[PDB]
Design a binder for these strands. Structure first.
Ligand SMILES: Nc1ncnc2c1ncn2[C@@H]1O[C@H](COP(=O)(O)OP(=O)(O)NP(=O)(O)O)[C@@H](O)[C@H]1O
Ligand SMILES: Nc1ncnc2c1ncn2[C@@H]1O[C@H](COP(=O)(O)OP(=O)(O)NP(=O)(O)O)[C@@H](O)[C@H]1O
Ligand SMILES: [Mg+2]
Ligand SMILES: [Mg+2]
Ligand SMILES: [Mg+2]
Ligand SMILES: [Mg+2]
Ligand SMILES: [Mg+2]
Ligand SMILES: [Mg+2]
Ligand SMILES: [Mg+2]
Ligand SMILES: [Mg+2]
Ligand SMILES: [Mg+2]
Ligand SMILES: [Mg+2]
Ligand SMILES: [Mg+2]
Ligand SMILES: [Mg+2]
Ligand SMILES: [Mg+2]
Ligand SMILES: [Zn+2]
Lengths: 230, 547, 49
RNA sequence: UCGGUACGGUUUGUGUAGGAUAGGUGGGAGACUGUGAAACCUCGACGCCAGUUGGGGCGGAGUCGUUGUUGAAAUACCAC
RNA sequence: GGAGCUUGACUGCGAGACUUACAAGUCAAGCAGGGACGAAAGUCGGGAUUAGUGAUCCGGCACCCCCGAGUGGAAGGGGUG
């Protein structure tokens, strides 16, 4: 897109390692206003994902939300099915949702089920498998407490999982937020990446890092800043 | 660039025949190495070190961390289950029992306690996203349509010779290891499957070692060429037309260096017998140099090559084989339909066809081990055949190579003549104390050579050879085709070596089946080069195997 | 032609015995049933490589 | 001048089905319009039977996607 | 001379002898563990017997975890094969 929008690509210097505070400033005045863009974080970790023990996988709890509709599907029966619809989930399925999903309907983001309900969802997980919509018991989605997990989807749980070529991908919030509020969701994630640092990782753990919107180019950020995101 | 395999000061020797002596080399990813050398050099013993099967005598031949290794042996094994179950034992080996555990916990965790089994269906589910095994069914349904495998629900006993190699190539090419070890991958395959394996091994992340004797598979898959001489390994780059130059040059300078060493002995042996004159003494320094030059003239005897010599049979008459409207089939599938030919006298008939079309069943109607469905075969009273199957008796893996040619006897009948058995196996290369090697430790170039010793002692005048150009190097492959031209009977040869049927053939029988018939053959009076010209007067996208 | 081979136990992998075979008559590994002093009972011993 | 490393720009990927040449992950309903939106023509690059784009109609009308379709996976565009 | 099953071609010891300048060389019933064969008694620490080989030093390897130069490790040494 060598276009007139590339005047927004002239402010960001490619050899200037900015701060997480000035990353959110350049995030606003790079994105246009006709789309309500989303600010992204791309981290190139120093892990070798060929070995299984160096697999950075985990979640986060963003303390300021993300600005997302957060469509929830819940596999539950009984009062568990009525607790999820009282929590604020629009689609609270049941055992009949076996038929509705495999017929070509996957209009939800994250699944929540009891371990009793998972007996009949995992056979349908052939199509929920590679899409990441499958229930994962480490992120609280397969448990008895199916009530607080619904609000935490609205609370801003983001599932980060490193790819095959050692890259992280992570959203921090919409471009209608403040500059001081993006860096509070940003600094709450690097704190949760370093917790899930593998113990057998050679070299510098957070090598190159960059922040961009849905349309704007990259903004180089400083890896040495791990404490002063305020 | 972090390596895949390294060797450090490795020396492996079977006593007097060394295979390695102080070798050191590294294999980095993206290498395309084709390893060559004559029979007895040690090519299949090097690849069994790199697979973790064998171990060297001394030295340290280890592997990089991670970096799983898959080997294709020169005679690949199979199980006794179906073809669809034959491919899941490698490539889907460890990952099917994770799939056979995740469906187990889909009903076991419901009727049991859901706190320890919660993570047991969790860390399985973390091993289904980076390996992408949710659609493991259709990953098998692609890898069979790439090699064009036989169908799923049949046993692996009544398969071809090339269908048993198509089903073994699908095992290793599903694993995708970081170090392939292909020991003769193009045996028993047709021209369609070798052309497939050229384009597949081009784009392949990982090291490829491939020992081949042919010259056209190697120039498409290999850019670096490793050699195995008497112990030593000589890596360089080229395209096998420069291998035969440099191999014939090492023997050129060695021939006129051992000859110069020989004339230094006769001038020195004349000194040590000259007799000491008056009180001056013969010097003990020069006696010691002669006794060390005589020893280095004995570790150089390398010339031992005998031509393959086919015994002549009795006089052959005018009717050799007559075939009148032959039909052969095992099921509703038909292989041969309305075939009429008559084998000539004093010629070579080449049989042409792709895999699984009925070339070996055609020989088993002539020898009578099968039975025609309709129509007859007629032999003729002067014809005495010579043929041994690859599967009904073959060889015995703990009888020695002397008592497989013989049966424990001293002199044998090769057809109305008496020759000694040890003078007969020594005419086929097996000389000295190598005549006590059992059949399990014989290599592929001396199992094909043993199989010619069993067929040709029957003294026939109609020899039937099913792929004699199998694991033979260019020195004895030219020696075999020399003896098929000095043969006064009829020889019928099934082969896939296109540049062996172009050289010694006089008549071509070829499968020309198409969609409406699929079982018609064709008799041609002439050589293979003129059959290709007559083929066009009568009258593709590479399948991916992965994603 | 008669090399010296060492026989190792197939349970605890101690090398308890050394002996000689013939390399042309027995190309494969020698399995005998010898007495391991570590285990305290006769167990299957096999050559090393 | 010829090599190495670091950083950056452009480019490259064809099953079997699916307008057809879908590299991997995340975002995503809008991306662009001082022109190749239409539009032909020529010429240079790659090749699996086509996508790469220096511009002549020039800046005026509409191309692409969000829908549906097929499949393990979707189409713009951007980020690594 | 032939056939069946097998690994005692053992581990821990060995009173007492032959030979002998020394160093070496040779035989040994019998006790215990754990086995082979035999219905048992029993026999088996390679071959009918005597040749088929090389002291010590210095090194290699597997095992035992014995010492560990301030202490915990490790290096290196040590034992048995
Ligand atoms: N006993 C049998 N029963 C059923 N089908 C058989 C039997 N023997 C062979 N076939 C099938 O018959 C077809 C041809 O057999 P065969 O003559 O061995 O082919 P082929 O020429 O040897 N193939 P190749 O030699 O590797 O190029 C294949 O589809 C085989 O699976
Ligand atoms: N266990 C063994 N004991 C004794 N000799 C062996 C043993 N294994 C292999 N050999 C010998 O060493 C040679 C090495 O075989 P090798 O050359 O590796 O097969 P090869 O090179 O693949 N023959 P070829 O495939 O025709 O090129 C054999 O031909 C035997 O003569
Ligand atoms: Mg071989
Ligand atoms: Mg055949
Ligand atoms: Mg024997
Ligand atoms: Mg002994
Ligand atoms: Mg004593
Ligand atoms: Mg006892
Ligand atoms: Mg008993
Ligand atoms: Mg005794
Ligand atoms: Mg004796
Ligand atoms: Mg000394
Ligand atoms: Mg200390
Ligand atoms: Mg030590
Ligand atoms: Mg002791
Ligand atoms: Zn033991």
């Amino acid at each position: 897109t060598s276009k007139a929008y590339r005047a927004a690509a002239a402010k960001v210097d490619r050899t200037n390692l900015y701060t997480p505070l000035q990353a959110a400033k350049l995030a606003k005045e790079t994105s246009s206003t006709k789309q309500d863009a989303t600010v992204e974080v791309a981290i190139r970790l120093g892990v070798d994902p060929r070995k299984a023990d160096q697999m950075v996988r985990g979640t986060v709890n963003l303390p300021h939300g993300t600005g997302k509709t957060a469509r929830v599907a819940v596999f539950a029966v009984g009062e568990k099915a009525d607790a999820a619809v009282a929590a604020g989930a629009d689609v609270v399925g049941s055992d009949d949702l076996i038929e509705r999903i495999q017929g070509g309907w996957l209009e939800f983001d994250a699944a929540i089920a009891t371990p009793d309900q998972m007996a009949k969802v995992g056979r349908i997980a052939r199509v929920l498998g590679p899409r990441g919509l499958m229930p994962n018991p480490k992120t609280g989605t397969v448990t008895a407490d199916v009530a607080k997990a619904v609000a935490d989807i609205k609370g801003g749980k983001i599932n980060f999982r490193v790819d095959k070529q050692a890259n992280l991908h992570f959203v921090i919030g919409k471009a209608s937020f403040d500059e001081k509020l993006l860096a509070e969701n940003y600094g709450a994630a690097i704190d949760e990446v370093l917790r899930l640092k593998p113990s057998s990782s050679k070299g510098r753990y957070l090598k190159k890092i960059t922040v961009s919107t849905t349309t704007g180019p990259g903004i180089p950020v400083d890896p040495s800043i791990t404490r002063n995101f305020a | 660039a972090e390596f895949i395999y390294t060797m450090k000061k490795v020396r492996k020797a079977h006593g007097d025949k060394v295979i390695l002596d102080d070798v050191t080399l590294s294999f980095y990813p993206g290498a395309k190495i084709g390893v060559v050398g004559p029979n007895g050099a040690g090519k299949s013993s090097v690849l069994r070190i790199m697979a973790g099967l064998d171990k060297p005598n001394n030295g340290d031949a280890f592997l990089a961390t991670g970096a799983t290794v898959g080997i294709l042996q020169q005679e690949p094994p199979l199980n006794e289950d179906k073809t669809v179950r034959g491919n899941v034992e490698e490539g889907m080996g460890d990952i099917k029992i994770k799939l056979d555990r995740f469906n187990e916990v889909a009903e076991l965790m419901a009727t049991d306690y859901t706190d320890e089994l919660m993570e047991e269906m969790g860390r399985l589910q973390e091993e289904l996203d980076h390996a992408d095994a949710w659609d493991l069914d259709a990953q098998l349904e692609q890898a069979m349509d790439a090699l064009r495998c036989p169908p799923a629900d049949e046993p692996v006993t009544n398969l071809s010779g090339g269908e048993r190699r198509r089903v073994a190539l699908c095992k290793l090419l599903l694993s995708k290891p970081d170090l392939l070890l292909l020991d003769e991958p193009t045996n028993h395959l047709d021209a369609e499957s070798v052309q497939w394996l050229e384009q597949h091994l081009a784009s392949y992340p990982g090291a490829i070692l491939a020992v081949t004797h042919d010259r056209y598979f190697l120039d498409n898959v290999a850019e670096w060429i490793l050699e195995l001489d008497r112990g030593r390994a000589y890596p360089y780059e080229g395209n096998y037309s420069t291998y035969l130059e440099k191999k014939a040059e090492r023997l050129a300078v060695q021939g006129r260096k051992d000859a110069k060493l020989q004339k230094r002995l006769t001038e020195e042996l004349a000194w040590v017998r000259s007799g000491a004159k008056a009180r001056q003494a013969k010097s003990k320094a020069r006696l010691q140099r002669y006794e060390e030059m005589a020893a280095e003239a004995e570790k150089t005897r390398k010339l031992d090559f005998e031509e393959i010599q086919i015994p002549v049979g009795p006089r052959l008459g005018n009717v050799v084989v007559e075939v009148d409207h032959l039909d052969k089939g095992y099921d509703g599938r038909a292989l041969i339909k309305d075939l009429s030919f008559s084998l000539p006298r004093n010629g070579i008939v080449g049989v042409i066809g792709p895999n699984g079309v009925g070339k070996t069943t055609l020989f088993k109607t002539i020898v009578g081990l099968e039975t025609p469905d309709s129509g007859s075969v007629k032999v003729g009273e002067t014809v005495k055949l010579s043929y041994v199957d690859q599967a009904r008796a073959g060889i015995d893996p703990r009888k020695t190579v002397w008592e497989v040619v013989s049966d424990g006897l001293d002199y044998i009948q090769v057809g109305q003549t008496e020759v000694p058995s040890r003078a007969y196996v020594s005419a086929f290369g097996f000389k000295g104390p190598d005549q006590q090697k059992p059949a399990g430790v014989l290599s592929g170039g001396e199992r094909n050579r043993l199989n010619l010793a069993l067929t040709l002692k029957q003294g026939g005048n109609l020899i039937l050879l099913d792929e004699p150009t199998n694991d033979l190097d260019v020195e004895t492959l030219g020696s075999l085709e020399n003896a098929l031209l000095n043969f006064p009977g009829c020889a019928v040869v099934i082969s896939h070596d296109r540049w062996f049927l172009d050289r010694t053939c006089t008549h071509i029988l070829a499968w020309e089946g198409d969609d409406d018939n699929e079982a018609k053959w064709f008799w041609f009076e002439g050589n293979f080069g003129a059959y290709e010209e007559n083929k066009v007067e009568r009258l593709v996208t590479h399948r991916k195997l992965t994603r | 032609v008669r090399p010296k081979i060492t026989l190792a136990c197939e349970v605890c992998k101690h090398r308890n015995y050394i002996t000689k075979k013939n390399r042309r008559n027995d190309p494969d590994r020698l399995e005998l049933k010898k007495f391991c002093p570590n285990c305290g009972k006769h167990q299957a011993h096999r050559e090393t490589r």
